[PDB]
């Protein structure tokens, strides 16, 4: 394994489709093409992929993270982590953690004041990954994931 983390090439159409396949496999409820186009066309610099260079398919994405940023209230920039997917065969190698780190590093260099995400309260692996980086739970949303249970709103303050 020789994982490489690189920014998204918006010109590559095959790279685009590969990201959709990764994210859709994990979701119980999927996203339309225009969900992906809302993120990737307006914030192309905030989506990253992971590829295995020594794999038989070197440039295929095996993991990705999709992010946006917008002013919150009027005075603070809020980064947002929309999607995080890692291929089933590549789990357990810290790939998701590296994708989060490179995305937050990009958003911090873009002067984001905070990073926000939502996750399941039953998702121990996601909570352990984010809270280990300094995220804290700021809110609990009742039945946010329907029959999958409530959600936590996680925020990491940068300024």
């Amino acid at each position: 394994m020789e994982i490489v983390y690189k920014p998204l090439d918006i010109r590559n159409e095959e790279q685009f489709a590969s990201i959709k396949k990764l994210i859709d496999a994990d979701l119980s409820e999927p996203y339309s093409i225009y969900v992906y186009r809302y993120f990737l066309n307006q914030w192309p610099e905030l989506t990253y992929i992971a590829v295995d260079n020594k794999s038989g398919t070197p440039n295929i994405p095996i993991g990705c993270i999709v992010c946006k940023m917008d002013p919150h209230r009027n005075v603070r920039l809020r980064g947002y982590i929309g999607m995080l997917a890692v291929e089933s065969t590549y789990r357990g190698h810290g790939i998701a953690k590296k994708l989060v780190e490179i995305a937050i590093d990009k958003m911090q260099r873009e002067h984001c004041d905070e990073i926000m995400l939502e996750t399941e309260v039953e998702n121990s692996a996601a909570l352990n990954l984010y809270e280990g980086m300094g995220f804290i739970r700021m809110k609990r949303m009742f039945r946010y994931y329907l029959n999958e249970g409530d959600a936590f709103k996680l925020i990491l303050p940068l300024t």
Partner: peptide, 10 residues
């Protein structure tokens, strides 16, 4: 606004 399309069918 393209955020309105995030709740679209396919």
């Amino acid at each position: 606004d393209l955020f309105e399309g995030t709740h679209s069918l396919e």
